[PDB]
Amino acid sequence: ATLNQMHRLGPRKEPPKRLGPTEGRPQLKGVVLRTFIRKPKKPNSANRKCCRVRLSTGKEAVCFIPGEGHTLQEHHVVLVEGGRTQDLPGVKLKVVRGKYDCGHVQKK
Amino acid sequence: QNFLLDLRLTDKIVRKAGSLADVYVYEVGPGPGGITRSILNANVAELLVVEKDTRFIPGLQMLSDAAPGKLRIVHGDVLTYKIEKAFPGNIRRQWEDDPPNVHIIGNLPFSVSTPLIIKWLENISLKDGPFVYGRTKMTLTFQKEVAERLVATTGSKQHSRLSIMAQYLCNVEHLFTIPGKAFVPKPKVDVGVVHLTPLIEPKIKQPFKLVEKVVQNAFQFRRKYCHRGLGMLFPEAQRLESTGRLLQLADIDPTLRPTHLSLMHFKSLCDVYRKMCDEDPQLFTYNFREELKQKKSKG
Amino acid sequence: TRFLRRKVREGRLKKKQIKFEKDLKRIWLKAGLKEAPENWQTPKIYLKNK
Amino acid sequence: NLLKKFSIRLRVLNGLLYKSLTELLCTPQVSQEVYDLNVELSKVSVTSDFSACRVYWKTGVSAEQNKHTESVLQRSAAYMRHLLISQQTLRNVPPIVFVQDKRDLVLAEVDRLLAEADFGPPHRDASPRSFLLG
RNA sequence: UAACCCAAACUAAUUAUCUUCGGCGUAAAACGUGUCAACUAUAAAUAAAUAAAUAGAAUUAAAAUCCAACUUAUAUGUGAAAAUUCAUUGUUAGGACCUAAACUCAAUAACGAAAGUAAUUCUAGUCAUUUAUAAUACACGACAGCUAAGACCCAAACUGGGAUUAGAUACCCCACUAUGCUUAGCCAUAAACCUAAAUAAUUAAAUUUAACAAAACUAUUUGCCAGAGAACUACUAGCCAUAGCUUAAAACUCAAAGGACUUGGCGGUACUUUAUAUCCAUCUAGAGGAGCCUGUUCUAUAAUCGAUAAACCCCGCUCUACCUCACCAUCUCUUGCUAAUUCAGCCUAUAUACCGCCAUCUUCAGCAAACCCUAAAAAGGUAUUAAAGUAAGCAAAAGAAUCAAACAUAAAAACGUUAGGUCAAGGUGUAGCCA
Ligand SMILES: [K+]
Ligand SMILES: [K+]
Ligand SMILES: [Mg+2]
Ligand SMILES: [Mg+2]
Ligand SMILES: [Mg+2]
Ligand SMILES: [Mg+2]
Ligand SMILES: [Mg+2]
Ligand SMILES: [Mg+2]
Ligand SMILES: [Mg+2]
Ligand SMILES: [Mg+2]
Ligand SMILES: [Mg+2]
Ligand SMILES: [Mg+2]
Ligand SMILES: [Mg+2]
Secondary structure (H helix, E strand, O other): OOHHHHHHHOOOOOOOOOOOOOOOOOEEEEEEEEEEEEOOOOOOOOOEEEEEEEEOOOOEEEEEOOOOOOOOOOOOEEEEEOOOOOOOOOOOEEEOOOOOOOOOOOOO | OOEEOOHHHHHHHHHHHOOOOOOEEEEEOOOOOHHHHHHHOOOOOEEEEEOOOHHHHHHHHHHHHHOOOOEEEEOOOOOOOOOOOOOOHHHOOOOOOOOOOEEEEEOOOHHHHHHHHHHHHHHHHHOOHHHHHOOOEEEEEEEHHHHHHHHOOOOOOOOOHHHHHHHHHEEEEEEEEEOHHHEEOOOOOOEEEEEEEEOOOOOOOOOHHHHHHHHHHHOOOOOOOOHHHHHHHOOHHHHHHHHHHHHHHHOOOOOOOHHHOOHHHHHHHHHHHHHHHHHOHHHHOOOHHHHHHHHOOOO | OHHHHHHHHHHHHHHHHHHHHHHHHHHHHHHOOOOOOOOOOOOOOOOOOO | OHHHHOOHHHHHHHHHHHHHHHHHOOOOOOOHHHHHOOOOEEEEEEOOOOOOEEEEEEOOOOHHHHHHHHHHHHHHHHHHHHHHHHOOOOOOOOOEEEEEEOHHHHHHHHHHHHHHOOOOOOOOOOOOHHHHHO
16 A cells, blocks of 8 residues: 555554453353253264353353263353363353362262 | 265155155156165055166166065156056045145156156146145155246246246245255256145136146246237237237236236236137137248248 | 345335435424425435336 | 467267368368368267267278378368367367278278179375484 | 473463554456546646547448249258258349348458447548546446337247157257347446556666566556455445345354465276287187086085185195094093293184285386486476486396207296285294183
8 A cells, every 4th residue: 555545544453352252251150051962073073071051141152061070960050161172163161170069070 | 867875865855755654655766766765664555666767677676675565666757657546546535635645756857857747737737647646745856946936936036937837736845955966977956855735726727728828928028028928829910909908807017027927917817818718719729939930921 | 035025125115215204304393493394395215206 | 478379979979070071171171182182081980088089081002192191181180170160060079080991992892702703593203203312 | 100391389261462664467455438626746848640439321242031934843951860841942144122241351450448349432520638646426338138119131048849868948950039130218237357557667686586477676646455154145325227236244153265386196098009829800629518527606514724706616635435634523631742941732813913935917117226407396307410417236138947059938027016815834923722
């Protein structure tokens, strides 16, 4: 662009950073609604443990439960955090192990 | 032609067709038999298949052995083979009754699908042929956009002779479109699956050939004032007067384009045209592409 | 679905006319007139006038 | 710039290509030499892939006459392909190859003998990991 | 388990800190065409006189069409037919018509802003603003399409009849229509692209500054672009358009999308030469039938195993009455071949862990290390009146054997191909059995 064109337009317009699953918040608290399995996109082949939760904001989201084995059930309380599950499409939330009803993986 | 080798999709096609348990199914152009296998595994009481190619008959016969007493194979043309008495007469139902226990499903080439449905549409008007059992439903494959026209509504760019002819005789529903990549040889167009159920009361109650002529003359020029197309039904000497009378009696604005002619509009035209054909029987035989050939001093 | 599009087009244009008419009523009412200017009739500009 | 720049269907293509190439060789359109050769065409056989087009021309008695006819015909085969695309006989034409057909000589031979015949009365390797260690 | 990092912290989540002097032929982007403003830059006082710009009027050579005379028995059409046709056909230095389009020239490169424009004649007509720079204005805008009235030679979506195929709504044939033409109105779209914005420079900066296009680069002014799909989409607004046209998002979802090159492959390599006891042909004796001998499969038995398309089937076997023997039934032995050994022994599973020895293409012709060169190389490296290639191996050839000589026959035949065959020639990895 010419200097006259740069002057008339000024600095480049920067669209604001889009909010993610946590809505620009470190963590959210949600109530478990259902516990189900999600199938990772091929080439990945597994039965990943996830749960649907109603977050404090009022929306409903799917959250991956990390660790080998969880005791979560409906009506339980959990603290979810950010971080996408790469193989699971649409799963942008994860459960925090060791907070509220969710407990640390049981080393056996 | 295009073949379907995916057993998952044939099972999906049967699943889309609904419950075939205890139903007398007539399959057209079974070919390799992928659809035939799915129909046989749907608790079908009796299945009759007509394959014109003798090369595929041995494959069908082998499938018949795998399903003893469930498969019937005829080496013939679907366009000519008569199924009026293929199934017992006790399953026949009245035209106003619920659809009989007869359902015609099949994946045919598009060369065969278009002539087959046109002949069957006349049979629906005649209530004969495959429709002697009543308002038999047909789940047939067509070219993606031919199916769009079979279901296209008034004013649609796909609205044409397929829309008026098919819809006035049947309730036409486009189920889904199958991708072409899985077909051998590969077609460059997708394949639309259409479900057709004959109507208890046809939208137009005139001879099938009369409706076909009126629909054809109307849609010969899609972008013209319909008055242009309807004029070709009448000899030039009486074209101006008769065309004005026809539109005046049918209560249609002469400037309405063929695409904006609804099913009820054609019914009014067909009803008026029927009276005119009774007044002059020679009018029904007029062809504008032949009178003009024979007008130039035929002698 | 062209039929619906024409139906949507004719109903969209009708709302487009009402918005035009209402915007003209706001102007004279705000100015303090209690009736539209004498010999004025809002032109119908979105109808099949051509 | 210039230097860089420089079943039923086969029955239809085989017959039409023969019908057209016969006309090209009946005039000097290809060349005056090709016209003077007075070449005759037995048949045209197009391959299934359409990679090439065989043109069978009735060979003669003299080998020298045939050797000359072959060279002249082959040189013009590329140009002959141009004339068929330009007159709009066929949109796509394969590289035309000229083949000999000596059956014509045999066909005359049979009649001569047959007339005279006596019928009688009726990763680790790629990586520096191994190297860095020592 | 060890190591590494940080350390009274540590690791996750979230948020913030980094912000336009870059581009617009092929990747995002010059967005159909010209003209008039205000700025910003620039500086000269010309232009035009041009072959097919454009509009109008008149005109007509070739080929059709129609009427008439004469006239074959056919004409038409395809790769081959059918349909169509005899109210046809051929000829006419006969008449009528003036519909439509403009051969050669044109191997030319003119005109116009673009679209576009080349039969002849005549009339009107292009021209000076220093130059670049314009929309919310004005005027145009191929083809296709609509409206009304005409035209209609031929062509022709479509429609109908005839063929085709395992079947084509296809490709092909015949007939005919919208339409292509004209005069009045509308539509405003093209890969409307020379895919190049418009101007004034320069040819040196020891500048292929990716590559392919079209040598490169500088200055000026405007327009445009900012990862991809969603999207020539939704909505809004304008419009004789009403499925349209122009303008043009978000959610959403991902780590790619995209461009130019180079290679390898197989596809239908079916094409031209090719095989040589071979693909067909030629020739001789056989096999395929009968009887037996023998291998295999099957059936079948308490009763081996392996080979088992070419490249198994008188195969391991140049060899099973016992032995051979690895199989089956039944009885018996437990430190049970050896100098020693909580050891001996093991034809127990995997030839898809291997050695070994082979089949196969095969008497096929390739496999090619080390150097050297390239405006960078993903690779390539030949010219003999020679132009970047070179000097060494492996196979072939040669040599030797069949006891003169040749020829022939044997032998030889690299690297790969078939996880080809063989754990049962033997040896062996791993796992399994030890009254
Ligand atoms: K037809
Ligand atoms: K081996
Ligand atoms: Mg682009
Ligand atoms: Mg004229
Ligand atoms: Mg003049
Ligand atoms: Mg016409
Ligand atoms: Mg909007
Ligand atoms: Mg084996
Ligand atoms: Mg023995
Ligand atoms: Mg023994
Ligand atoms: Mg043993
Ligand atoms: Mg020797
Ligand atoms: Mg040798």
